[PDB]
Symmetry: C4
Subunit: 225 residues, 4 copies
């Protein structure tokens, strides 16, 4: 009751979240310096223990947050994200987790209010995009299957798999080395390969243009009214 009110008044105070922010920036500087190998021979003893103390502080502070807000902490996406980040950082995963630990720096966007505002502004335009995202995914899946069965035996590196055909169709979509890297080599053996790729590029570019216009008229519809 009084303990609760006092400890919640600590958890949702400014100085608490500010202290967490400043641990975040200091530890961001830390992880920036830890990529330097000469630096690590000299100061690795210190930098590792600094990461240890920040992570215990974070785990304690989500213990307090989750104490204050039991169900609503798990109903809240930002705190859900802080939980899952410190949890990943807490697990001892074949070293692939060491690189995942630096995701804790993303907590900066959850701790600081303006960053939180812009990333929710970013997520909010995604609902309107689901229709075109699914249209494009189906178009890519149908074309990936055709590109695989058309070019897979003679070009195993680029189209031998459904997965590699996704990859290289996605490359083509970004128009990166499309004709010189993939189409023209293909035409040295399959001469009408452009019949598959020119339409692919045209439809993909037009749908991608329509995606971005679709966004604007949404941000404008909330504006003119």
């Amino acid at each position: 009751g009084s303990m609760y009110l006092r400890i919640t008044n600590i958890v949702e105070s400014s100085f608490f979240t500010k202290f967490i922010i400043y641990l975040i920036v200091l530890n961001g500087i830390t992880m920036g310096l830890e990529t330097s190998k000469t630096f690590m021979q000299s100061f690795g003893v210190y930098t590792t223990l600094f990461k240890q103390i920040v992570i215990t502080i974070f785990t304690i502070e989500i213990i307090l947050r989750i104490y204050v807000h039991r169900i609503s902490f798990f109903k809240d996406p930002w705190s859900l994200f802080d939980f899952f980040v410190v949890a990943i950082s807490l697990v001892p995963g074949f070293e692939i987790l060491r690189v995942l630990r630096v995701l804790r720096l993303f907590r900066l966007v959850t701790a600081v209010p303006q960053m939180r505002k812009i990333v929710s502004a970013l997520i909010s335009v995604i609902p309107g995009m689901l229709s075109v995202i699914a249209l494009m995914t189906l178009f890519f899946y149908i074309f990936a299957i055709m590109a695989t069965q058309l070019f897979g035996e003679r070009f195993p590196e680029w189209f031998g798999t459904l997965g590699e055909s996704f990859y290289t169709l996605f490359q083509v979509m970004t128009l990166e080395s499309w004709s010189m890297g993939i189409v023209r080599p293909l035409m040295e053996v399959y001469p009408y390969a452009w019949v598959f790729f020119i339409p692919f590029i045209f439809v993909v570019t037009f749908v991608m243009i329509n995606l971005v216009v679709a966004i604007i008229v949404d941000a404008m519809a909330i504006l003119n009214q």
Copy 2:
């Protein structure tokens, strides 16, 4: 009369189109697995016959649809598309048709209502573009002819044909390896080649920008009113 009303009540029922949708997704999974050669040695006997039964079901179900709606089925673009897809899938074409058979997966967009809504939204912005499309096609045709007669003998691979000059001008338009892949090699022998290509890129980029702005002010004109 009563038979008609009963069989039309079956054809335009939800469960019918839903069953067709679920055959579509199952067969999409099927065609996804059929690109895998090891999978096919094991289960090709089954996967081929699954494709056989889905295609007979589709042909039966367009027989029913076309029965219900004789003229209007052929006046309807989505059903016209389903007809032509199953028809392609029904024809025994030098194996080039085997890859065309996976176009049947596109029926998913015609069967499901939201996909149908977004692709007609996509087609509908095309009318407004016809003017600029034809302007660009004429500009490409005039430039393709000049690039052919300017660079064709000394660069047969890139400009020896009107068709190859279309191709490589289209490549340049996507700005993919423009100077490094085509212009600079050309300048090693024809030093003023940039006089042809820099304007080409400028006019092409400006017209393409104007295309996309042209789209927005159309989607906005239906909005502000």
Copy 3:
């Protein structure tokens, strides 16, 4: 007087301009077929004389047009363009003119009304762009001079001239092989070369974005009112 009224009624009749249009499309087909060398061994005798008769018809028909409208023909940009095109096509220029002759196909846009409408729509957005065009040209000129004097001796092919530095800065602007083609080779000898090019790319991209937004708010300003 009556002769005038009758011959002007012929020049500004539909069938006259339509006949000119159909000569244009036939001759476009002609010039398309003339790039084919095997075709020319067979039918070059005919195709050349077809180009001769169309060009005499065009010169006669601008003689009539300029007869009808003396000063205003020269005050009119479309007719100014037809004049200069047939004039180029009439001059016997070291064969560089043979390729310029196909510019006569552009007369199609001047003869047909809808094409004329869209290309003036295209020209009309250019006035608003003069400010940013001149800002960019000054920025390119200042940077081209620095890139020349910084990298010209050790990289004569890319930056040895002010002209070659324009060219390759323009290439960088289109982001085509920027780091792999130019920056990274430069850094193998001049390690801080990115200090010149990263800002260049940032400012160039931001100004180019601002150019395109600048266009939209103009096309919208004529709309919301």
Copy 4:
């Protein structure tokens, strides 16, 4: 008093700033010609002294400007820029300053009113971008650290440093040789490298799209009202 009023009437007269403008354009022509080495053997004696007289004139004329407007000259960004430019041009820096001297040509934008108007129009859209700029910088910093610690030992040239990982992530962002130049070489040894780069590209492209839409709705918000 009277001297002041007379000398301020000279400094803020048109002909004064116009004369400075014409020195600027003449000296721009000069610096354009100075990159030419054959030109310099012939006329370098003259061109260097021309640059000497223009720079003394500029230093005198900012002496007069700063005389007229003591505090407000330093409170004014355009005059602050002219000051710092002539000051750089006045310092005798291991020849790295010789190339910086051509920045004096940028004074043209500060002297001429329309250029001044468009560049402040350009700066003014930057405030609204700070939120997304900082979001992207944090995302790049977190990913640069992961790309360094994931790929640095086996790819020292592209990811051996935090700085080189910034560079090549920025390259990927411009989609320049992404898969062919970096991802596919990486996959020859680290096969799941796309799990790092495909998301990177998706999030980076979406945030960059949102940046540009963010700009438009700002330029439109000042318009519809």
